[PDB]
Structure formats: C-alpha cells, structure tokens
C-alpha cells in the first residue's frame, strides 16, 4: 500500500519499489546513431572567461550542466546569476533544443527563466529519481526552505523554432544515488537526447573528461586535453551531410 508511510518507517524511498529498472527497433536505431556520430571533440575552456561565440557552427542540441553549489554539500560553483548571463542564444540554431540540469531547488524556477531568456519554450521536465537501495540508513542535511527530503533532480528540455524516427522514451531516469562528492549525471540523459534524432551538432557545456562521447562536442574547465578545431568540426556537417537527423544512413561517396 503506502510507500510514503514506509519511507517514514524504514528510510527506504518509495522509488526503491519501482519494478523493471518489442524493441528490436532500438538495435537498428542505436546502430544508426553510432554510425552517424561525429568523432568525439572536446575543448578545455573556462566558460566564465571564454567567448561562447568561438563555438561554431550553431548547435542543434545543447546540454548545459553548470556546477550548482547544491551538488557539493558533504569558488568554482556557478550561481543562477552567472548561468542566466550565458549567451546561449548566440550559439543555438534557430531550430534547436536545450537540456538544462536545474537541480532540485531554486533552479526549477530560475532554469525556466533562463530557457525563456535564451528564446526557448520548456517542453519536457525530465526527473532523475534517485533510489537508496544500497544505504537506506543515511540522513541528508535539509536545505532550509525544503519541506520534504529531496530525492530527485530535474533536467528541463527547451525548444526554439517550429515542431524511422519515432518516440519510445519516458521523462524519468531511475538510478541509485551516487556516492558523496560524485557529481556525475546519469549517462541515460544522452540516450534520451540521441533517441530524439534532432541533428548531429551537439554541445555539452560544463562536460568533463568522464563525459566525452562520440557525436558530442564537450566544453568545460576541467578537461585535461583539447582536440577542437572549428574548421574540422564544421567539415563534419558540410554538404551533403548538413540536414542529417543523426538516426539515418551516412550518405555514400567515392
């Protein structure tokens, strides 16, 4: 019956009790994504100092993972003041998508302000629901405004412009709560984004060595190495490859 009472009784989060956590489609499709993917490209850049307009061409998808103070609670952290001042509209394609990790506090409001500031409309709210199966007997220090124990983070999806390539994913990711000081987001967010087949120019801002991935440009201050060349990157999307969704056959040459 009541998983809320059960959490109060035992410290086992209700999400611990979700089960199952047809599709020979997904083989053929994860396959086409893998074949259409650009080689991974990455650039160490202090994004507060760096002029974002140096990142060309204009992106189909932007994943934005600013390091919020709330991720570290056990200098280099970004406030919503800092984030809202990023010139995201200057690098987004006129038809494009954003995925913004907003945390579980004031970001759920300030991230929506950011999306609309950059010219997007919030179209999905993806919740990362965290289980505590391995350690139900731990007690987090509550944020002062919090009414409830916070057990999830939100990734807001934004769209700008107008609305073999369907839709099977759900607006939930369920994983175990990471060890203390592990600030990684579930790699499942990349799976959801790639499955939308939105185009091949994909930017991950505030990514890390650990998040570098085929089909993505990763930009962040902690990257140890760079391979980014604007001209090389642009050449991946040159004719005849300009309008590929990232879920179709690579176009044949000689």
């Amino acid at each position: 019956n009541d998983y809320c009472q059960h959490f109060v009784d035992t410290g086992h989060r209700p999400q611990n009790f979700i089960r199952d956590v047809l599709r020979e489609l997904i083989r053929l499709k994860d396959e086409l994504i893998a074949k259409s993917n650009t080689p991974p490209m990455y650039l160490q850049a202090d994004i507060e100092a760096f002029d974002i307009r140096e990142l060309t061409p204009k992106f189909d998808v932007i994943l934005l993972e600013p390091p919020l103070e709330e991720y570290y609670r056990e200098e280099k952290c970004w406030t919503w003041d800092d984030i809202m001042k990023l010139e995201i509209d200057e690098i987004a394609a006129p038809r494009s998508f954003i995925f913004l990790w907003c945390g579980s506090g004031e970001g759920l409001d300030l991230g929506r302000v950011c999306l609309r500031k950059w010219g997007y409309r919030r179209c999905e709210d993806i919740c990362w629901i965290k289980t505590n199966k391995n350690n139900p007997g731990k007690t987090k220090t509550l944020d002062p405004k919090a009414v409830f124990q916070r057990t999830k983070e939100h990734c807001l999806m934004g769209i700008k412009g107008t609305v073999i390539h369907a839709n099977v994913d759900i607006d939930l990711i369920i994983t175990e709560e990471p060890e203390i000081g592990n600030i990684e987001k579930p790699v499942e967010i990349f799976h959801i984004i790639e499955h939308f087949c939105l185009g091949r120019r994909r930017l991950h801002l505030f990514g890390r060595d650990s998040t570098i991935r085929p089909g993505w440009l990763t930009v962040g201050p902690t990257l140890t190495n760079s391979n980014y060349n604007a001209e090389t990157y642009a050449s991946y999307f040159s004719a005849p490859n300009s309008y590929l969704t990232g879920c179709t056959e690579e176009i044949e040459r000689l």
Binding site: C4, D20, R122, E124, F148, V168
Partner: protein, 213 residues
Amino acid sequence: ADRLFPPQWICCDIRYLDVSILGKFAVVMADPPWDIHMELPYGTLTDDEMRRLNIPVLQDDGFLFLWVTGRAMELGRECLNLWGYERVDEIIWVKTNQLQRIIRTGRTGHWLNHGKEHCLVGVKGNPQGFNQGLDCDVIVAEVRSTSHKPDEIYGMIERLSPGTRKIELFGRPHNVQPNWITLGNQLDGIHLLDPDVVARFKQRYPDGIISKP
C-alpha cells in the same frame, strides 16, 4: 496535533464562492482543471479565472500544494507567486499499476512519454511547528478511478501538519477527509460542522444559494 475534526464539503462553482467565510488554513491544496490549450471532455478555468481565485484570503502562514501539468507548470508558478507564495518544493507522483510498473502515457504534442504528475509546494508567511523532511518528494502510487490524485498526498500533509485545518479546491467526493474542507462542483450539496464556519456561512448565504456575484 491530536485533532481529527470530521470531513466537511461545499458543492460550488469555486469561481463564485466567497472563501472569506471559511477562515484560515495551515495547508491549501488545489487540483485545477487548467486550460492546457486543447479540446477536453471537462470544463477548464481560463488563465484569468485561475489568477483571480481568492487564494490569498485562505492562509496567513502555511503551505500550498498546487498540481500542475503541461503549460500549467509555468502558469501554476505565476499563480503561486501572484497569490503571495514562494515555491519551495516540487513533489512528483510516479503513476504505477498494481505490480509497481510505471504507467506511461503519450500526448501527440509531446517528445516523451510522461511517467509522473507534478505538485508545486508553496510557502506563505512564517509557518511554525510543521514537521519538514519526514517525507520525501517522490510518491509511487497506483492510478484510481474515484480520484485524480493519490491518497498518499493526504498522509504526507498530515505528517507535515498534524491536526491543523486544511482546505482542498477541485476535490472529488472520494477526497473528503478529516481536518479537510473540500470544495468542488461534483460534491453532493453542503456539509459543515465547524461552528465558526457554520455561523459565517449562514450569515453570508442565509438562503443557502451560491450564485455568480
């Protein structure tokens, strides 16, 4: 905290009821039929009708639980702020079957199947003596035919604020509960026991009719 005052309700158009007669509540919950910009089988309130709801008269110090879907994730935030609340939490209800498997629904407007319903939590004033942090912000519960929302929310609210008077807007008959007054247009007449409220109701509505004012 001991108090368990029996269920009370008022069948009304919530646009027209004078909620000043009901006094003050530790917790407000609303589950509005938001205008989500599509042909629906039920009546919706316009954005302006939602904005104009006299929520500010219901509380001095306490919490607001506001269910939101689709474009109402943004309109509900506007209403919450307009009514004098700060959003301080957001509950999600993961809808399951009897076997704790997620029920995943798809709109033709949408990029993703939806596994959850959102509830904004607002605070007004200086609430004292609430039990913050007993429950967590994820409900896992079965879809029922008699209610739009899971009964688990009433337990979370009771643990948060035991024995305090509470008010629900856009409630169904299954939703009537001890310590709650339920408002909605599918309820069966009027049922009032709080002498303070019965007086003020008689005095405001002596011919027991709640017409367009």
